[PDB]
């Protein structure tokens, strides 16, 4: 397929990143960022006409996705219509031959979430091939589109949007459905920010959440108070709470990642996922949230000869330090690496790197003949039962 | 590598000496062919 024909869509808990037309040398930041939202005019006959704008205030702003989950599947397929049709019309205005070049056959690469149901993705394929009439479709998961950003085989995907946190173990490029645990999102970061900065509002604490002076401790730190600027350009100073706020969610994710990855009967894949902890989402432009999340993981779930007993047998050694040999799995806890060879993504950050691995997957599979990973039109001639035939 | 002597006096396989022993210079193999000119106005 053509990378100018490639459409990549990531609806997240607030915003939907859309890119049509890859940058094709290094992949770009997803240029379009809609909110994850579509107005629906309930036409009085019960039919629904779907708009991007509040059409005569009979339209209701239906977010198709918050907390990652599809929360209106028909409005999500019509938000796929709203985005897709917009790509078609905008390339019918800007390019106008793209209906033979970019819109002649759009390999629609849609980023899915763990909380999207089976009937959700089947109705997605139905509306995509019958009502969107899209002959070629990947439903790429957000965890795999995170893990292919450096084709990581075993990792932990922590989708911290502003609203929700997924903890998703990936083993052999595949998600454990029984171990995915979604605990709440930068609103839990905002929540302990409000616990620690009571005098502020949601705009001040959210601008702190998108401030450069936002860290977690586990120089901004040597300063007691630091000054960032509000959305209206007002200088706001903050004490040690700019080293805090994320720490409550850090402990919540940390205990949830421990209870996720220590319950595995396979003692070895636990450590390989334990050393590739990935934390993604529009919140995760916060500095130090991933760092103190790792530090709290090492605080809660790192198996070692503990400092009482390792100090005791440091003293037994000074009588070369041996370690009391434990049997448990989480003995090494580490994070994973981000591809620095994308200057568009080096510049525009890796907080939404799910789109980056989606771009890499799109240049892989679509520019390949491999329809083992996308449904063809003839493959629809098993339908969304061929959606079950085109998974990775 | 244990040896009582290095390679031949002309020494072009100083690469192959250093390549099997070290991961140093196997990327640009054609580097030091101009820089092996040291073994082959006597003062200048």
């Amino acid at each position: 397929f053509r990378q100018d024909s490639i459409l990549i869509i990531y609806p997240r808990s607030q915003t939907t990143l859309v890119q049509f037309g890859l940058n094709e040398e290094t992949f770009t930041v997803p240029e379009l960022e809609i909110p994850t939202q579509i107005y629906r005019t309930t036409r009085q006959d019960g039919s629904y006409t779907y708009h991007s704008t509040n059409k005569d205030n009979k339209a209701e702003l239906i977010k198709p996705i918050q907390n990652g989950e599809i929360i209106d599947i028909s409005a999500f397929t019509q938000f796929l219509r709203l985005i897709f049709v917009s790509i078609l019309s905008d390339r019918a205005n800007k390019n106008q031959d793209a209906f033979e070049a970019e819109l002649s056959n759009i390999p629609l690469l849609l980023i899915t979430h763990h909380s999207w149901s089976q009937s959700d993705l089947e109705i997605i394929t139905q509306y995509v091939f019958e009502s969107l009439e899209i002959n070629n479709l990947i439903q790429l998961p957000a965890s795999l589109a995170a893990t292919y950003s450096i084709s990581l085989q075993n990792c932990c995907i922590i989708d911290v949007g502003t609203h929700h946190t997924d903890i998703i173990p990936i083993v052999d490029y595949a998600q454990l459905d029984h171990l995915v645990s979604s605990i709440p999102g930068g609103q839990s970061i905002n929540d302990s920010l409000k616990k620690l900065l009571p005098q502020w509002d949601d705009d001040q604490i959210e601008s702190l959440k998108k401030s450069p002076i936002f860290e977690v401790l586990s120089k901004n730190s040597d300063l007691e108070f630091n000054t960032f600027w509000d959305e209206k350009g007002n200088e706001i100073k903050v004490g040690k709470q700019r080293f805090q706020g994320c720490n409550n969610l850090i402990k919540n994710i940390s205990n949830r990642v421990g209870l996720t990855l220590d319950n595995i009967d396979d003692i070895n894949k636990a450590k390989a996922v334990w050393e590739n902890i990935i934390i993604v989402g529009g919140t995760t432009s916060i500095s130090g949230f991933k760092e103190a999340l790792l530090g709290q993981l090492l605080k809660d779930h790192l198996i070692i000869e503990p400092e009482e007993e390792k100090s005791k047998r440091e003293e037994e050694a000074k009588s070369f330090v041996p370690t009391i040999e434990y049997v448990q799995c989480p003995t090494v806890i580490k994070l994973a690496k981000y591809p620095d060879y994308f200057p568009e993504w080096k510049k525009s950050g890796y907080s939404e790197i799910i789109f980056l691995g989606a771009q890499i997957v799109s240049k892989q599979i679509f520019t390949h003949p491999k329809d083992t990973f996308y449904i063809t039109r003839e493959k629809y001639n098993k339908g969304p039962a061929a959606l079950w035939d085109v998974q990775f | 590598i244990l040896t009582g002597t290095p390679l031949q006096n002309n020494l072009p396989e100083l690469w192959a000496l250093l390549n099997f022993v070290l991961p140093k210079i196997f990327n640009s193999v054609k580097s030091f062919d101009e820089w092996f000119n040291t073994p082959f106005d006597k003062i200048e």
Partner: protein
Amino acid sequence: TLNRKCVVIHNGSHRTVAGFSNVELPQCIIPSSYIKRTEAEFIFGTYNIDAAAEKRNGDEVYTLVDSQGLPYNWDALEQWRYLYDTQLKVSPEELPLVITPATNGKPDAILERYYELAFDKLNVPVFQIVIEPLAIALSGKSSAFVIDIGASGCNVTPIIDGIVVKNAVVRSKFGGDFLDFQVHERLAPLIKEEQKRSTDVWYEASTWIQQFKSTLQVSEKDLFELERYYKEQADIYAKQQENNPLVQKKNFLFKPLNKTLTLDLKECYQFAEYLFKPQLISDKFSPEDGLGPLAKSVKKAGASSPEQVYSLLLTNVIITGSTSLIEGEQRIIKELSIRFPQYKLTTFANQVDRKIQGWLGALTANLPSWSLGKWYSKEDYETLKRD
């Protein structure tokens, strides 16, 4: 196969494992127990651990399913609504159903209760009940000698040409939960701590007892035999020079204390010795209750030619179960190759997928004919409702 999306559920004595036929993984693996949070709140779900991390007063992890593989809390198991909506996110009335312990032919009832559970309680329009040790034999073998060391115990089932040798199906007591009691019992001085407490005991069986279990062992011979042999080996190594493999520390890091719990190799062996020798824990349990002479389930299968049954079983051994994923199968090979050396033990086992092997066998759902298994219509309830 046929155009179907069946629901594949394995209900073990401790684990409720659920997904569909068109997904080869379960959508969830929650307990077949519940932290009855106390309102009564039958908290199913593994992490919903965290409620039992509160260890709350009134929170009571009762099982739904006892040690026979049959549920004793069926409407709290109707957990089935929790499965289909909070985990599967589908109507059970949409999809067909495959649900997985063998017996002697008497409780062939529970199906009526599943006529309750799939037609009345959930109105699943068709449900297929499969035999779980026969499902483990399926995922492509016709006859087997299935030993499931699950949470319930060592469940031995002979299977000859697909039929169940009903007199020879023997299920032991000593599996996961008795070893939860055992690991809670022996590391009790080292954890310094020493159903309703199932919120203490099941929670510890979720946090550290399993962390001592997936990390327990079985001796490949008898531990008394391996113990005497390794003591003889260490005496040879000591007397020749002037080391025992059993004197080395398998320390456990009890994370509610962050403390070294030095149990040795023989010590971790001794827990799973009670599955083969439960006379070492209580006098009321014979070595026949252990897995070796459980041989007896081969011999009781000899009455269904008995040596042909022995040929089929002892050349078609099948190993499965949660507590069988504790290291040490070679104990089964040694312990039954001394009671039956005549047919060499060519065993089969899922080694991972072993703890959910009944689910994978029920998933094999994906049979190419609806006539290959008995799929119960609502009319099949109506026929079973008559006479």
